[PDB]
């Protein structure tokens, strides 16, 4: 599918470390590897435009 540029968002484990999987923080920590000690995902997709609520009362 040429229309699709890139879909593989999540990286399955570390390319240079199969046994070691890039761990993830709770928020604003990114994903680091316990081997090569890398840090993937420094940015933070902040798209506030969905309201986010438990349905309106009225
Ligand atoms: Zn690694």
mmCIF file with all atom_site columns, N, CA and C and ligand atoms in Angstrom:
data_model
loop_
_atom_site.group_PDB
_atom_site.id
_atom_site.type_symbol
_atom_site.label_atom_id
_atom_site.label_alt_id
_atom_site.label_comp_id
_atom_site.label_asym_id
_atom_site.label_entity_id
_atom_site.label_seq_id
_atom_site.pdbx_PDB_ins_code
_atom_site.Cartn_x
_atom_site.Cartn_y
_atom_site.Cartn_z
_atom_site.occupancy
_atom_site.B_iso_or_equiv
_atom_site.pdbx_formal_charge
_atom_site.auth_seq_id
_atom_site.auth_comp_id
_atom_site.auth_asym_id
_atom_site.auth_atom_id
_atom_site.pdbx_PDB_model_num
ATOM   1   N  N   . UNK A 1 1  ? 0.842   -1.225  0.000  1.00 0.00 ? 1  UNK A N   1
ATOM   2   C  CA  . UNK A 1 1  ? 0.000   0.000   0.000  1.00 0.00 ? 1  UNK A CA  1
ATOM   3   C  C   . UNK A 1 1  ? 0.864   1.257   0.000  1.00 0.00 ? 1  UNK A C   1
ATOM   4   N  N   . UNK A 1 2  ? 0.953   1.907   -1.155 1.00 0.00 ? 2  UNK A N   1
ATOM   5   C  CA  . UNK A 1 2  ? 1.748   3.123   -1.289 1.00 0.00 ? 2  UNK A CA  1
ATOM   6   C  C   . UNK A 1 2  ? 1.128   4.268   -0.495 1.00 0.00 ? 2  UNK A C   1
ATOM   7   N  N   . UNK A 1 3  ? -0.195  4.247   -0.369 1.00 0.00 ? 3  UNK A N   1
ATOM   8   C  CA  . UNK A 1 3  ? -0.910  5.284   0.366  1.00 0.00 ? 3  UNK A CA  1
ATOM   9   C  C   . UNK A 1 3  ? -0.438  5.349   1.815  1.00 0.00 ? 3  UNK A C   1
ATOM   10  N  N   . UNK A 1 4  ? -0.034  4.202   2.353  1.00 0.00 ? 4  UNK A N   1
ATOM   11  C  CA  . UNK A 1 4  ? 0.442   4.129   3.729  1.00 0.00 ? 4  UNK A CA  1
ATOM   12  C  C   . UNK A 1 4  ? 1.954   4.317   3.793  1.00 0.00 ? 4  UNK A C   1
ATOM   13  N  N   . UNK A 1 5  ? 2.383   5.427   4.382  1.00 0.00 ? 5  UNK A N   1
ATOM   14  C  CA  . UNK A 1 5  ? 3.805   5.725   4.509  1.00 0.00 ? 5  UNK A CA  1
ATOM   15  C  C   . UNK A 1 5  ? 4.461   4.814   5.543  1.00 0.00 ? 5  UNK A C   1
ATOM   16  N  N   . UNK A 1 6  ? 3.992   4.901   6.783  1.00 0.00 ? 6  UNK A N   1
ATOM   17  C  CA  . UNK A 1 6  ? 4.533   4.085   7.865  1.00 0.00 ? 6  UNK A CA  1
ATOM   18  C  C   . UNK A 1 6  ? 3.465   3.801   8.918  1.00 0.00 ? 6  UNK A C   1
ATOM   19  N  N   . UNK A 1 7  ? 3.249   2.522   9.205  1.00 0.00 ? 7  UNK A N   1
ATOM   20  C  CA  . UNK A 1 7  ? 2.257   2.117   10.193 1.00 0.00 ? 7  UNK A CA  1
ATOM   21  C  C   . UNK A 1 7  ? 2.926   1.534   11.434 1.00 0.00 ? 7  UNK A C   1
ATOM   22  N  N   . UNK A 1 8  ? 4.090   0.922   11.243 1.00 0.00 ? 8  UNK A N   1
ATOM   23  C  CA  . UNK A 1 8  ? 4.830   0.323   12.348 1.00 0.00 ? 8  UNK A CA  1
ATOM   24  C  C   . UNK A 1 8  ? 5.274   1.382   13.351 1.00 0.00 ? 8  UNK A C   1
ATOM   25  N  N   . UNK A 1 9  ? 4.357   1.783   14.226 1.00 0.00 ? 9  UNK A N   1
ATOM   26  C  CA  . UNK A 1 9  ? 4.653   2.791   15.237 1.00 0.00 ? 9  UNK A CA  1
ATOM   27  C  C   . UNK A 1 9  ? 5.458   2.191   16.390 1.00 0.00 ? 9  UNK A C   1
ATOM   28  N  N   . UNK A 1 10 ? 4.888   1.196   17.092 1.00 0.00 ? 10 UNK A N   1
ATOM   29  C  CA  . UNK A 1 10 ? 5.557   0.543   18.221 1.00 0.00 ? 10 UNK A CA  1
ATOM   30  C  C   . UNK A 1 10 ? 6.677   -0.389  17.772 1.00 0.00 ? 10 UNK A C   1
ATOM   31  N  N   . UNK A 1 11 ? 7.844   -0.245  18.394 1.00 0.00 ? 11 UNK A N   1
ATOM   32  C  CA  . UNK A 1 11 ? 8.996   -1.074  18.061 1.00 0.00 ? 11 UNK A CA  1
ATOM   33  C  C   . UNK A 1 11 ? 9.062   -2.297  18.970 1.00 0.00 ? 11 UNK A C   1
ATOM   34  N  N   . UNK A 1 12 ? 8.974   -3.480  18.369 1.00 0.00 ? 12 UNK A N   1
ATOM   35  C  CA  . UNK A 1 12 ? 9.019   -4.724  19.118 1.00 0.00 ? 12 UNK A CA  1
ATOM   36  C  C   . UNK A 1 12 ? 10.426  -5.018  19.627 1.00 0.00 ? 12 UNK A C   1
ATOM   37  N  N   . UNK A 1 13 ? 10.656  -4.749  20.908 1.00 0.00 ? 13 UNK A N   1
ATOM   38  C  CA  . UNK A 1 13 ? 11.958  -4.992  21.521 1.00 0.00 ? 13 UNK A CA  1
ATOM   39  C  C   . UNK A 1 13 ? 13.047  -4.157  20.855 1.00 0.00 ? 13 UNK A C   1
ATOM   40  N  N   . UNK A 1 14 ? 14.266  -4.275  21.371 1.00 0.00 ? 14 UNK A N   1
ATOM   41  C  CA  . UNK A 1 14 ? 15.405  -3.538  20.837 1.00 0.00 ? 14 UNK A CA  1
ATOM   42  C  C   . UNK A 1 14 ? 16.015  -4.276  19.644 1.00 0.00 ? 14 UNK A C   1
ATOM   43  N  N   . UNK A 1 15 ? 16.276  -3.562  18.533 1.00 0.00 ? 15 UNK A N   1
ATOM   44  C  CA  . UNK A 1 15 ? 16.857  -4.164  17.327 1.00 0.00 ? 15 UNK A CA  1
ATOM   45  C  C   . UNK A 1 15 ? 18.174  -4.877  17.606 1.00 0.00 ? 15 UNK A C   1
ATOM   46  N  N   . UNK A 1 16 ? 18.973  -4.302  18.496 1.00 0.00 ? 16 UNK A N   1
ATOM   47  C  CA  . UNK A 1 16 ? 20.267  -4.879  18.848 1.00 0.00 ? 16 UNK A CA  1
ATOM   48  C  C   . UNK A 1 16 ? 20.212  -5.611  20.189 1.00 0.00 ? 16 UNK A C   1
ATOM   49  N  N   . UNK A 1 17 ? 19.006  -5.823  20.709 1.00 0.00 ? 17 UNK A N   1
ATOM   50  C  CA  . UNK A 1 17 ? 18.838  -6.516  21.982 1.00 0.00 ? 17 UNK A CA  1
ATOM   51  C  C   . UNK A 1 17 ? 17.479  -7.209  22.053 1.00 0.00 ? 17 UNK A C   1
ATOM   52  N  N   . UNK A 1 18 ? 17.403  -8.470  21.592 1.00 0.00 ? 18 UNK A N   1
ATOM   53  C  CA  . UNK A 1 18 ? 16.156  -9.240  21.607 1.00 0.00 ? 18 UNK A CA  1
ATOM   54  C  C   . UNK A 1 18 ? 15.735  -9.628  23.021 1.00 0.00 ? 18 UNK A C   1
ATOM   55  N  N   . UNK A 1 19 ? 16.689  -10.127 23.801 1.00 0.00 ? 19 UNK A N   1
ATOM   56  C  CA  . UNK A 1 19 ? 16.418  -10.534 25.175 1.00 0.00 ? 19 UNK A CA  1
ATOM   57  C  C   . UNK A 1 19 ? 16.010  -9.336  26.024 1.00 0.00 ? 19 UNK A C   1
ATOM   58  N  N   . UNK A 1 20 ? 16.653  -8.199  25.780 1.00 0.00 ? 20 UNK A N   1
ATOM   59  C  CA  . UNK A 1 20 ? 16.358  -6.979  26.521 1.00 0.00 ? 20 UNK A CA  1
ATOM   60  C  C   . UNK A 1 20 ? 15.325  -6.131  25.786 1.00 0.00 ? 20 UNK A C   1
ATOM   61  N  N   . UNK A 1 21 ? 14.220  -5.837  26.462 1.00 0.00 ? 21 UNK A N   1
ATOM   62  C  CA  . UNK A 1 21 ? 13.157  -5.036  25.871 1.00 0.00 ? 21 UNK A CA  1
ATOM   63  C  C   . UNK A 1 21 ? 13.159  -3.616  26.425 1.00 0.00 ? 21 UNK A C   1
ATOM   64  N  N   . UNK A 1 22 ? 13.027  -2.640  25.533 1.00 0.00 ? 22 UNK A N   1
ATOM   65  C  CA  . UNK A 1 22 ? 13.008  -1.237  25.934 1.00 0.00 ? 22 UNK A CA  1
ATOM   66  C  C   . UNK A 1 22 ? 11.862  -0.972  26.906 1.00 0.00 ? 22 UNK A C   1
ATOM   67  N  N   . UNK A 1 23 ? 12.202  -0.660  28.152 1.00 0.00 ? 23 UNK A N   1
ATOM   68  C  CA  . UNK A 1 23 ? 11.196  -0.386  29.170 1.00 0.00 ? 23 UNK A CA  1
ATOM   69  C  C   . UNK A 1 23 ? 10.589  0.997   28.971 1.00 0.00 ? 23 UNK A C   1
ATOM   70  N  N   . UNK A 1 24 ? 9.389   1.198   29.504 1.00 0.00 ? 24 UNK A N   1
ATOM   71  C  CA  . UNK A 1 24 ? 8.705   2.481   29.380 1.00 0.00 ? 24 UNK A CA  1
ATOM   72  C  C   . UNK A 1 24 ? 8.358   3.051   30.750 1.00 0.00 ? 24 UNK A C   1
ATOM   73  N  N   . UNK A 1 25 ? 8.417   4.374   30.866 1.00 0.00 ? 25 UNK A N   1
ATOM   74  C  CA  . UNK A 1 25 ? 8.109   5.047   32.122 1.00 0.00 ? 25 UNK A CA  1
ATOM   75  C  C   . UNK A 1 25 ? 6.601   5.199   32.301 1.00 0.00 ? 25 UNK A C   1
ATOM   76  N  N   . UNK A 1 26 ? 6.201   6.067   33.226 1.00 0.00 ? 26 UNK A N   1
ATOM   77  C  CA  . UNK A 1 26 ? 4.787   6.301   33.494 1.00 0.00 ? 26 UNK A CA  1
ATOM   78  C  C   . UNK A 1 26 ? 4.262   7.480   32.681 1.00 0.00 ? 26 UNK A C   1
ATOM   79  N  N   . UNK A 1 27 ? 5.146   8.430   32.381 1.00 0.00 ? 27 UNK A N   1
ATOM   80  C  CA  . UNK A 1 27 ? 4.784   9.609   31.607 1.00 0.00 ? 27 UNK A CA  1
ATOM   81  C  C   . UNK A 1 27 ? 5.934   10.604  31.588 1.00 0.00 ? 27 UNK A C   1
ATOM   82  N  N   . UNK A 1 28 ? 6.383   10.933  30.388 1.00 0.00 ? 28 UNK A N   1
ATOM   83  C  CA  . UNK A 1 28 ? 7.483   11.876  30.197 1.00 0.00 ? 28 UNK A CA  1
ATOM   84  C  C   . UNK A 1 28 ? 8.824   11.232  30.529 1.00 0.00 ? 28 UNK A C   1
ATOM   85  N  N   . UNK A 1 29 ? 8.900   9.914   30.368 1.00 0.00 ? 29 UNK A N   1
ATOM   86  C  CA  . UNK A 1 29 ? 10.133  9.202   30.653 1.00 0.00 ? 29 UNK A CA  1
ATOM   87  C  C   . UNK A 1 29 ? 10.702  8.501   29.433 1.00 0.00 ? 29 UNK A C   1
ATOM   88  N  N   . UNK A 1 30 ? 9.879   8.341   28.398 1.00 0.00 ? 30 UNK A N   1
ATOM   89  C  CA  . UNK A 1 30 ? 10.310  7.683   27.170 1.00 0.00 ? 30 UNK A CA  1
ATOM   90  C  C   . UNK A 1 30 ? 10.579  6.201   27.412 1.00 0.00 ? 30 UNK A C   1
ATOM   91  N  N   . UNK A 1 31 ? 11.115  5.530   26.397 1.00 0.00 ? 31 UNK A N   1
ATOM   92  C  CA  . UNK A 1 31 ? 11.425  4.108   26.498 1.00 0.00 ? 31 UNK A CA  1
ATOM   93  C  C   . UNK A 1 31 ? 12.923  3.871   26.345 1.00 0.00 ? 31 UNK A C   1
ATOM   94  N  N   . UNK A 1 32 ? 13.546  3.324   27.386 1.00 0.00 ? 32 UNK A N   1
ATOM   95  C  CA  . UNK A 1 32 ? 14.969  3.063   27.371 1.00 0.00 ? 32 UNK A CA  1
ATOM   96  C  C   . UNK A 1 32 ? 15.269  1.567   27.343 1.00 0.00 ? 32 UNK A C   1
ATOM   97  N  N   . UNK A 1 33 ? 16.450  1.212   26.840 1.00 0.00 ? 33 UNK A N   1
ATOM   98  C  CA  . UNK A 1 33 ? 16.857  -0.187  26.763 1.00 0.00 ? 33 UNK A CA  1
ATOM   99  C  C   . UNK A 1 33 ? 17.808  -0.534  27.911 1.00 0.00 ? 33 UNK A C   1
ATOM   100 N  N   . UNK A 1 34 ? 17.614  -1.699  28.556 1.00 0.00 ? 34 UNK A N   1
ATOM   101 C  CA  . UNK A 1 34 ? 18.458  -2.128  29.677 1.00 0.00 ? 34 UNK A CA  1
ATOM   102 C  C   . UNK A 1 34 ? 19.831  -2.634  29.234 1.00 0.00 ? 34 UNK A C   1
ATOM   103 N  N   . UNK A 1 35 ? 20.096  -2.588  27.930 1.00 0.00 ? 35 UNK A N   1
ATOM   104 C  CA  . UNK A 1 35 ? 21.373  -3.044  27.396 1.00 0.00 ? 35 UNK A CA  1
ATOM   105 C  C   . UNK A 1 35 ? 22.154  -1.886  26.776 1.00 0.00 ? 35 UNK A C   1
ATOM   106 N  N   . UNK A 1 36 ? 21.772  -1.477  25.564 1.00 0.00 ? 36 UNK A N   1
ATOM   107 C  CA  . UNK A 1 36 ? 22.455  -0.371  24.896 1.00 0.00 ? 36 UNK A CA  1
ATOM   108 C  C   . UNK A 1 36 ? 22.186  0.948   25.614 1.00 0.00 ? 36 UNK A C   1
ATOM   109 N  N   . UNK A 1 37 ? 21.204  0.948   26.511 1.00 0.00 ? 37 UNK A N   1
ATOM   110 C  CA  . UNK A 1 37 ? 20.873  2.156   27.241 1.00 0.00 ? 37 UNK A CA  1
ATOM   111 C  C   . UNK A 1 37 ? 20.438  3.276   26.321 1.00 0.00 ? 37 UNK A C   1
ATOM   112 N  N   . UNK A 1 38 ? 19.443  3.000   25.484 1.00 0.00 ? 38 UNK A N   1
ATOM   113 C  CA  . UNK A 1 38 ? 18.939  3.999   24.552 1.00 0.00 ? 38 UNK A CA  1
ATOM   114 C  C   . UNK A 1 38 ? 17.692  4.672   25.112 1.00 0.00 ? 38 UNK A C   1
ATOM   115 N  N   . UNK A 1 39 ? 17.152  5.625   24.361 1.00 0.00 ? 39 UNK A N   1
ATOM   116 C  CA  . UNK A 1 39 ? 15.960  6.351   24.781 1.00 0.00 ? 39 UNK A CA  1
ATOM   117 C  C   . UNK A 1 39 ? 15.091  6.719   23.582 1.00 0.00 ? 39 UNK A C   1
ATOM   118 N  N   . UNK A 1 40 ? 14.133  5.855   23.262 1.00 0.00 ? 40 UNK A N   1
ATOM   119 C  CA  . UNK A 1 40 ? 13.236  6.094   22.138 1.00 0.00 ? 40 UNK A CA  1
ATOM   120 C  C   . UNK A 1 40 ? 11.905  6.677   22.606 1.00 0.00 ? 40 UNK A C   1
ATOM   121 N  N   . UNK A 1 41 ? 11.479  7.757   21.960 1.00 0.00 ? 41 UNK A N   1
ATOM   122 C  CA  . UNK A 1 41 ? 10.226  8.393   22.325 1.00 0.00 ? 41 UNK A CA  1
ATOM   123 C  C   . UNK A 1 41 ? 10.417  9.530   23.309 1.00 0.00 ? 41 UNK A C   1
ATOM   124 N  N   . UNK A 1 42 ? 11.091  10.586  22.865 1.00 0.00 ? 42 UNK A N   1
ATOM   125 C  CA  . UNK A 1 42 ? 11.343  11.745  23.714 1.00 0.00 ? 42 UNK A CA  1
ATOM   126 C  C   . UNK A 1 42 ? 10.197  12.748  23.621 1.00 0.00 ? 42 UNK A C   1
ATOM   127 N  N   . UNK A 1 43 ? 9.565   12.810  22.455 1.00 0.00 ? 43 UNK A N   1
ATOM   128 C  CA  . UNK A 1 43 ? 8.453   13.728  22.236 1.00 0.00 ? 43 UNK A CA  1
ATOM   129 C  C   . UNK A 1 43 ? 7.195   13.235  22.945 1.00 0.00 ? 43 UNK A C   1
ATOM   130 N  N   . UNK A 1 44 ? 6.178   14.089  22.994 1.00 0.00 ? 44 UNK A N   1
ATOM   131 C  CA  . UNK A 1 44 ? 4.919   13.741  23.642 1.00 0.00 ? 44 UNK A CA  1
ATOM   132 C  C   . UNK A 1 44 ? 3.729   14.270  22.848 1.00 0.00 ? 44 UNK A C   1
ATOM   133 N  N   . UNK A 1 45 ? 3.067   13.378  22.119 1.00 0.00 ? 45 UNK A N   1
ATOM   134 C  CA  . UNK A 1 45 ? 1.911   13.756  21.315 1.00 0.00 ? 45 UNK A CA  1
ATOM   135 C  C   . UNK A 1 45 ? 0.807   14.348  22.187 1.00 0.00 ? 45 UNK A C   1
ATOM   136 N  N   . UNK A 1 46 ? 0.804   15.672  22.310 1.00 0.00 ? 46 UNK A N   1
ATOM   137 C  CA  . UNK A 1 46 ? -0.196  16.363  23.114 1.00 0.00 ? 46 UNK A CA  1
ATOM   138 C  C   . UNK A 1 46 ? -1.277  16.975  22.230 1.00 0.00 ? 46 UNK A C   1
ATOM   139 N  N   . UNK A 1 47 ? -2.341  16.214  21.992 1.00 0.00 ? 47 UNK A N   1
ATOM   140 C  CA  . UNK A 1 47 ? -3.445  16.681  21.163 1.00 0.00 ? 47 UNK A CA  1
ATOM   141 C  C   . UNK A 1 47 ? -4.719  16.844  21.986 1.00 0.00 ? 47 UNK A C   1
ATOM   142 N  N   . UNK A 1 48 ? -4.831  17.977  22.673 1.00 0.00 ? 48 UNK A N   1
ATOM   143 C  CA  . UNK A 1 48 ? -6.003  18.235  23.489 1.00 0.00 ? 48 UNK A CA  1
ATOM   144 C  C   . UNK A 1 48 ? -7.148  18.821  22.688 1.00 0.00 ? 48 UNK A C   1
ATOM   145 N  N   . UNK A 1 49 ? -8.030  17.956  22.199 1.00 0.00 ? 49 UNK A N   1
ATOM   146 C  CA  . UNK A 1 49 ? -9.176  18.395  21.411 1.00 0.00 ? 49 UNK A CA  1
ATOM   147 C  C   . UNK A 1 49 ? -10.238 17.303  21.337 1.00 0.00 ? 49 UNK A C   1
ATOM   148 N  N   . UNK A 1 50 ? -10.354 16.524  22.408 1.00 0.00 ? 50 UNK A N   1
ATOM   149 C  CA  . UNK A 1 50 ? -11.334 15.443  22.463 1.00 0.00 ? 50 UNK A CA  1
ATOM   150 C  C   . UNK A 1 50 ? -12.223 15.561  23.701 1.00 0.00 ? 50 UNK A C   1
ATOM   151 N  N   . UNK A 1 51 ? -12.145 16.703  24.385 1.00 0.00 ? 51 UNK A N   1
ATOM   152 C  CA  . UNK A 1 51 ? -12.944 16.940  25.585 1.00 0.00 ? 51 UNK A CA  1
ATOM   153 C  C   . UNK A 1 51 ? -12.517 16.016  26.724 1.00 0.00 ? 51 UNK A C   1
ATOM   154 N  N   . UNK A 1 52 ? -12.742 14.718  26.544 1.00 0.00 ? 52 UNK A N   1
ATOM   155 C  CA  . UNK A 1 52 ? -12.382 13.730  27.556 1.00 0.00 ? 52 UNK A CA  1
ATOM   156 C  C   . UNK A 1 52 ? -13.258 13.878  28.796 1.00 0.00 ? 52 UNK A C   1
ATOM   157 N  N   . UNK A 1 53 ? -14.415 13.225  28.778 1.00 0.00 ? 53 UNK A N   1
ATOM   158 C  CA  . UNK A 1 53 ? -15.344 13.284  29.900 1.00 0.00 ? 53 UNK A CA  1
ATOM   159 C  C   . UNK A 1 53 ? -16.282 12.081  29.893 1.00 0.00 ? 53 UNK A C   1
ATOM   160 N  N   . UNK A 1 54 ? -16.983 11.878  31.004 1.00 0.00 ? 54 UNK A N   1
ATOM   161 C  CA  . UNK A 1 54 ? -17.916 10.762  31.123 1.00 0.00 ? 54 UNK A CA  1
ATOM   162 C  C   . UNK A 1 54 ? -19.311 11.169  30.659 1.00 0.00 ? 54 UNK A C   1
ATOM   163 N  N   . UNK A 1 55 ? -19.409 11.582  29.399 1.00 0.00 ? 55 UNK A N   1
ATOM   164 C  CA  . UNK A 1 55 ? -20.684 12.000  28.827 1.00 0.00 ? 55 UNK A CA  1
ATOM   165 C  C   . UNK A 1 55 ? -21.234 13.222  29.557 1.00 0.00 ? 55 UNK A C   1
ATOM   166 N  N   . UNK A 1 56 ? -21.956 14.065  28.827 1.00 0.00 ? 56 UNK A N   1
ATOM   167 C  CA  . UNK A 1 56 ? -22.539 15.270  29.405 1.00 0.00 ? 56 UNK A CA  1
ATOM   168 C  C   . UNK A 1 56 ? -23.729 14.926  30.295 1.00 0.00 ? 56 UNK A C   1
ATOM   169 N  N   . UNK A 1 57 ? -24.037 15.815  31.233 1.00 0.00 ? 57 UNK A N   1
ATOM   170 C  CA  . UNK A 1 57 ? -25.153 15.606  32.148 1.00 0.00 ? 57 UNK A CA  1
ATOM   171 C  C   . UNK A 1 57 ? -26.453 16.133  31.551 1.00 0.00 ? 57 UNK A C   1
ATOM   172 N  N   . UNK A 1 58 ? -26.347 17.193  30.757 1.00 0.00 ? 58 UNK A N   1
ATOM   173 C  CA  . UNK A 1 58 ? -27.515 17.794  30.123 1.00 0.00 ? 58 UNK A CA  1
ATOM   174 C  C   . UNK A 1 58 ? -27.747 17.200  28.738 1.00 0.00 ? 58 UNK A C   1
HETATM 175 ZN ZN1 . LIG B 2 .  ? 19.295  -2.196  23.241 1.00 0.00 ? 1  LIG B ZN1 1
#
